Structure 1
Amino acid sequence: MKVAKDLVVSLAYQVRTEDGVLVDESPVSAPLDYLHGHGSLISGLETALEGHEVGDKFDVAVGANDAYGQYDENLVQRVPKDVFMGVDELQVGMRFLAETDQGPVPVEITAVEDDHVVVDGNHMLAGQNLKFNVEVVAIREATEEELAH
C-alpha cells in the first residue's frame, strides 16, 4: 500500500529548523492523520509523502518557499485593545482567531501596550527551512466527513 490522493496518511514525524530547533514531534506511539492531495500537509512535505510505502522511513529537507512561504512584514499589523474578547489581560504571546474572507488566520501577540497591541499572523514555521524525519505508520481511505473538513 502506497500514499495516494484522498487517502489518509497517519504520520509520525520530527520537525527541526535549519538552526536545529525542534518544533514538535509525533511518535509512533501517538501518530497523527492528514489527507493527501489537498494542501493541508506542508506543500514540500506533501510532495515528499507522494507514493511512499507504509512504514517507510525517510528524511526530507523542506525550504522556506516550500512551507508557508517566506516571512513577510505586511502580515504584522497594529490593533487596539477593544478588538479582543474573552481575555482579562492581553499578555504577550496570547493567540486569537480572526475570521477573514480568505478563511481563518491565527493571530498572535508580539508586543503589548496598556491600550494598544501589535500582532503577527506569520506562522512560526514560516521563513525558516525545515527538515522532517518521517515514517508513514499506516494508510487508509478518507471518510466523507474528513473530506468535508
Structure 2
Amino acid sequence: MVEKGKMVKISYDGYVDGKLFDTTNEELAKKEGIYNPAMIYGPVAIFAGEGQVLPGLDEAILEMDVGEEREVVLPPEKAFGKRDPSKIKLIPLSEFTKRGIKPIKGLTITIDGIPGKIVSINSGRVLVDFNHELAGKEVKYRIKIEEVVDDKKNIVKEIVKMYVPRLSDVKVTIRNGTVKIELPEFAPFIPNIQTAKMAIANEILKRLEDAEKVSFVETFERK
C-alpha cells in the first residue's frame, strides 16, 4: 500500500470500448494514433490520493506497491462522471443552416461558447451532447507504480515538472533551508512562467518542511 500524500511516479494506458484514449507511453501513443506533439510523455508524478488523477485511479494507487502493475475498471462515477441529460439538447436545424453548417454525426460545434458533439439528426432537430466525451462511460487503465520519490532533490525536480512538464531537466541544489532551482535557457520564455514559479515554490514549501526558501535561477547566454 502507498500512503496518501506520498509522491509517486505512475505509467498508464487508458482504454474506452476497446480503444486507447490516453497513455504515458510515447511509442504506444504513436502506434495507436493519439500522439500529441504538445504533450510530454513518460512516467508522471502525483501526490497519491490527493485528486491529481481520476478518483478511481487515486483509489487504485493507494492500495498498490512500488513496481506493481495492474489493470482497473472504473465506473463513470469514478472516472469522467455520469452523462447529464440536461446537457443533451435538441437544437433547431435552422440554427445550423442559417450559419452555413451541414450538421453531421460526430461534428463538434460550439453554442454560447460551449462545445458539444452532434449526436443525431431527426426531422428539423439536431441533437447535440454538451457532456464530457467519456461521460457515462466505463474505462480501463493499465497502471504501474514506477517509483516512490522520497528524496528532497527529486521531489523538487518532480514538482517543477508537475507544474511545467517541459521543464524536465532542471538543476536542483538543496543548501540547508534553501532550494535552488536552475532553469534551462528556454524557461524565461514560457507563458506565465512567473505564476508557474510561484505555484512551484508554494508546492515545495508545503512538501519540504525544512525549506525556508525557494530561489529560481534564470540564465541568459551568448547564443
In which range does the TM-score fall when normalised by the shorter chain? 0.5 to 0.7
SS in 2 for 1:131: strand
Relative to structure 1, the CA distance from residue 61 to residue 114 in structure 2 (aligned partners, 3 Å threshold; closer, same or farther) is closer
CA contact (8 A) 1:12 1:28 kept: yes
* Greater helix fraction, Structure 1 or Structure 2: 2
Q: TM-score normalised to the size of structure 1? A: 0.60
Distance in 1 (CA, whole Å) between partners of 2:8 and 2:16 is 24
Give yes or no for the alignment of 1:78 onto 2:67.
no
Q: Deviations over 1:84-112 (max 9, x none)?
A: 9x874332211134567xxxx54111123
Give yes or no for the alignment of 1:41 onto 2:53.
yes
The number of aligned residues is 140
The corresponding residue for 2:214 is none
Give yes or no for the alignment of 1:93 onto 2:106.
yes
Q: Which amino acid counterpart does residue 122 of structure 1 have in structure 2?
A: N
5+ residue gaps, structure 1: none
Q: CA RMSD in A?
A: 4.4
Relative to structure 1, the CA distance from residue 50 to residue 71 in structure 2 (aligned partners, 3 Å threshold; closer, same or farther) is same
Distance in 2 (CA, whole Å) between partners of 1:34 and 1:96 is 34
Q: TM-score normalised to the size of structure 2? A: 0.44
Structure showing greater radius of gyration is 2
Q: RCO (CA 8 Å, sep 6+): is it higher in 1 or 2?
A: 1
Give yes or no for the alignment of 1:117 onto 2:130.
no
CA contact (8 A) 1:3 1:49 kept: no
Give the percent of matched residue pairs that are identical in Structure 1 and Structure 2.
18
Distance in 1 (CA, whole Å) between partners of 2:52 and 2:142 is 18
Relative to structure 1, the CA distance from residue 71 to residue 59 in structure 2 (aligned partners, 3 Å threshold; closer, same or farther) is same
